[model samples]
Target chain A: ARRILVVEDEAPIREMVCFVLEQNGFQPVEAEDYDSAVNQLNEPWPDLILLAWMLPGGSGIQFIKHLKRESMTRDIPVVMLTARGEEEDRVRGLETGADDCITKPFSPKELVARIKAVMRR
Target chain B: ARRILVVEDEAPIREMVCFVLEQNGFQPVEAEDYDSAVNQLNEPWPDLILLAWMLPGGSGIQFIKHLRRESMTRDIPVVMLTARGEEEDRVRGLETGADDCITKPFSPKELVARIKAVMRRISPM
Candidate 1:
């Protein structure tokens, strides 16, 4: 089984991460905080998920369109996309300060990808 | 008074256009239809309004931003802008065939400007 190192402050969150890893057939190396993480460090590890998505002013279907249209890249596995509406998230309050509600519909893939972009912003 | 050529098949619509022109201090240059509009053709006439706006996927305040930033263009007179809601107009069905009620709020100047663009797609008159 592949091993993953999970580091978190709270014991509840730590147990939750390890539990998920165990369920997914992964050997989870738990670390309650930084000191414990330093103690359990492996020599090296490669990590990350394989989902493809977009940036600001980018779209979800647009990614799938480009991905599937190519001869070489068409074989990559993709799961799904779903709709997200503006009022549900109160997006304008985060993007701006006022309670101005604005709708920016996006597939769920594009939604997560943009949160990374906005988090950096 | 500045003369404007208004040609419409219906007399009611023809009167409405002329009424608006007259109220705005322009001469009502009326035509019952295409034949009359052709007959009263002036030797030369420059046409159009001075309102600035945008095309697809555009916004209103953008025009004022660009217009006022430049010293040469800043002095032109402009009136104002307003809000629009999706539930009111049912906009998406026009862009596509399905009934999609999208909320693309813009200042009123952009609203009129885009309608002119959409009208040209069906007929030039």
Candidate 2:
């Protein structure tokens, strides 16, 4: 089973994602904001990360940049989850080193499927 | 088995891609031109489409736009293959509804990996 961290501020969305990921046999970890996400990374690194575009303090793009700059977590795969049809956000996310981007209103099946795809690659 | 359609005018690339996909357990179909590609689609839709940017008649962007407009083929995922790394070309391909755009000089392993990744989402499992 793959270990994946879900970094979303919204409690409902995080809970739903956790459920979906658990059903798919992934070891899901949760972080409500950027600070917590970094703290989680300080401990054990997950195989992949599912980051939301909008967090509490700043954009998830910053988190990706920070990860790339750090020697410890540079190569970890990240899949950014953004709102529906946010083309600009997708480009920014990809350029910043997120392995892939997933739009909002996506099915749980697609989310898990994308996570697996990125990790496999 | 998943069937993959490769639309490349270059025979060498088409042969290489077919061999790679076959090695990875995917049924590969090849079309050397736009008309052949369209004709193949009419027979049986493949799990995904890998289109080359420079075709014989028009740009591959036109093919992608046409696929998006068709009700039956609109939802099939396409991964655009291009030689140029220009940002303008990348944006054009994505804006035209390509699921992903990969540059040339890519490894056979990476190509097969991308095909599997796109197929997982487009064809489900």
Candidate 3:
């Protein structure tokens, strides 16, 4: 079992991610916005970071840069949460530093499957 | 129009192969077994060969060997027809020298699609 930092400012989607993670026997730590999201990178850091494009309301590059800048948080895997069929945003998230992306409106099955796959790799 | 020599001994399966080939605008040449199939390699030498496992009754290696033996007929791509889930049968057919294998209990669409795929690889425009 591993802990995932669920970084989204929204209610239902964030709830859904945490619910799926809990059901699949992984810990999900919720963070509302940028400073809170970055702070979680310290003390008992997440095994993986699940970022939303809305975490910064534009792009989450700064958070990724902050994570990757230091050796301590650099090894924690990052997965981006993207909206359905947002191809450009998926590309941007990946380019900046997400190990993989989960498109929204996803099945509980797909969410668990992708998270485990990213974790396994 | 390209001619497809469909070598199957059974009446119903032979007609099905011929019918499927004809519907797709290709001429279908029917041959009973090994020797007849070899003769068709001359004259309007078939553009492709479709051999059945039962055509040789035991193995179709002789026909495949014959097809690959000569330069004139060597270029005529051969596709083997096999029974469902016969993994070992498929291996023997390809090892002897078949370009591809198509499993039976197949649909008309699958038959045509595989035939076209084999032909396209040999001489695609």
lDDT of each: 0.36, 0.75, 0.74
Per-prediction TM-score to the true structure, in the order listed: 0.21, 0.46, 0.46
lDDT score, candidate 1, position A75: 41
The order of the candidates by lDDT, greatest first, is 2, 3, 1
Report the lDDT tens digits of candidate 3 across residue range B68-121.
778998888888877555544546534755778886545556778888888888
Q: State the DockQ of every prediction.
A: 0.01, 0.01, 0.01
lDDT at position A66, candidate 3: 82
TM-score of 1: 0.21
Off by over 4 Å in 2: A1-121, B84-94, B122-125
**Higher-DockQ candidate of 2 and 3:** 2
Q: C-alpha displacement of B118 in model 3, angstroms?
A: 1.2
lDDT of 2 by residue, A60-111 (tens): 8888887889888899898887754454545553566788977654555567
State how far residue A15 of model 1 sits from its true place (Å): 67
Off by over 4 Å in 3: A1-121, B56-58, B85-94, B122-125
Better of 1 and 2 by DockQ: 2
Candidate 3 residue-wise lDDT at A13: 64
Candidate 2 lDDT for residue A38: 83
